[PDB]
Design an enzyme around this catalytic site. Structure first.
Site, mmCIF file in Angstrom:
data_model
loop_
_atom_site.group_PDB
_atom_site.id
_atom_site.type_symbol
_atom_site.label_atom_id
_atom_site.label_comp_id
_atom_site.label_asym_id
_atom_site.label_seq_id
_atom_site.Cartn_x
_atom_site.Cartn_y
_atom_site.Cartn_z
ATOM 1 N N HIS A 85 13.358 3.751 13.232
ATOM 2 C CA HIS A 85 12.525 3.947 14.413
ATOM 3 C C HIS A 85 13.369 4.384 15.607
ATOM 4 O O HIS A 85 14.589 4.514 15.503
ATOM 5 C CB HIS A 85 11.773 2.659 14.750
ATOM 6 C CG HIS A 85 12.506 1.416 14.353
ATOM 7 N ND1 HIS A 85 11.956 0.443 13.544
ATOM 8 C CD2 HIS A 85 13.754 0.987 14.656
ATOM 9 C CE1 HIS A 85 12.832 -0.529 13.369
ATOM 10 N NE2 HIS A 85 13.932 -0.222 14.032
ATOM 11 N N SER A 86 12.711 4.611 16.739
ATOM 12 C CA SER A 86 13.399 5.039 17.952
ATOM 13 C C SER A 86 13.868 3.835 18.764
ATOM 14 O O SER A 86 14.306 3.975 19.905
ATOM 15 C CB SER A 86 12.480 5.916 18.803
ATOM 16 O OG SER A 86 12.433 7.242 18.305
ATOM 17 N N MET A 87 13.771 2.652 18.166
ATOM 18 C CA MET A 87 14.186 1.423 18.832
ATOM 19 C C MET A 87 15.699 1.247 18.755
ATOM 20 O O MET A 87 16.392 1.305 19.770
ATOM 21 C CB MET A 87 13.488 0.216 18.204
ATOM 22 C CG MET A 87 12.037 0.479 17.831
ATOM 23 S SD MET A 87 11.048 -1.028 17.788
ATOM 24 C CE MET A 87 9.541 -0.466 18.576
ATOM 25 N N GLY A 88 16.205 1.032 17.545
ATOM 26 C CA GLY A 88 17.632 0.851 17.359
ATOM 27 C C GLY A 88 17.953 -0.258 16.376
ATOM 28 O O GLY A 88 17.389 -1.349 16.454
#
Length: 242
Positions: A85-88
């Site tokens: 995801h684009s979270m990390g």
């Protein structure tokens, strides 16, 4: 203490996807792998339900080749695609990547996600500011100097020549005119022109190359039109709509 679905057969192709999403990259790769590949190991991350045996921890690779080939271990799957995801998650990735390189150097299919804004300090004639932001590793404000290593190995920075030569140390001054294996770029929500410039510079396009960018840059957010615009054309890049 975690759930993780998986289903491999004849060790065709490992496909790791933790809570994926259709969006565009899924609808684009779907037909790409469904027309170029087939019968590939399908696995994904699931939510917690009830303590069964142990936590996923991205260990289906060995857990499978062992729980199946327990009799005798020959060799795992060469290809391996991990979608995040684009979270990390430098942690989950650290295990995945490490398991890959350690499992087999010569890999064919490989997808990198969670591409951070930072970029391997280097010099390029792309733009008069490219080198500036390259060493600044900010692109919106991101303080980090002792993580540039754990990021290039986990986060999987966009800089190919960097990581590549950093994990192979065999890269040459020329990388153009190259195509055979499979790979795809994911994330790069901050900067997208960085990969387009440093990517086209070599004019190399593997048998199966795809690009999935979101758009969270300082300006990208300001102009929602450009954002949604790229996303659309991106999902239609491989296959245009009627």
């Amino acid at each position: 203490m975690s759930q993780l679905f998986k289903s491999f057969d004849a060790s065709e192709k490992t496909q790791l996807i933790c809570f994926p999403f259709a969006g565009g990259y899924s609808a684009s790769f779907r037909p790409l792998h469904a027309f170029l590949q087939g019968e590939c190991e399908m696995l994904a991350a699931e939510p917690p339900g009830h303590g069964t045996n142990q936590t996923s921890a991205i260990e289906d690779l060995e857990e499978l080749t062992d729980l199946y080939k327990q009799e005798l271990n020959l060799r795992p799957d060469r290809p391996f695609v991990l979608f995040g995801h684009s979270m990390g998650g430098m942690i989950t990735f650290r295990l995945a990547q490490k398991l890959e390189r350690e499992g087999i150097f010569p890999q064919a299919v490989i997808i990198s996600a969670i591409q951070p804004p930072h970029i391997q300090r280097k010099k390029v004639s792309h733009l008069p500011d490219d080198q500036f932001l390259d060493h600044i590793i900010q692109l919106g404000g991101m303080p980090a100097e002792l993580v540039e290593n754990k990021e290039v190995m986990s986060f999987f920075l966009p800089s190919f020549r960097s990581d590549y030569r950093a994990l192979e140390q065999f890269e040459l001054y020329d990388l153009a005119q190259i195509q055979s294996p499979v790979h795809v770029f994911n994330g790069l929500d901050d900067k997208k022109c960085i990969r387009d410039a440093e990517g086209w510079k070599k004019w190399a396009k593997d048998i199966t190359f795809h690009q999935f960018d979101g758009g969270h840059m300082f300006l990208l957010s300001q102009t929602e039109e450009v954002a949604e615009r790229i996303f659309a054309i991106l999902n239609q890049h491989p296959i245009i709509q009627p």
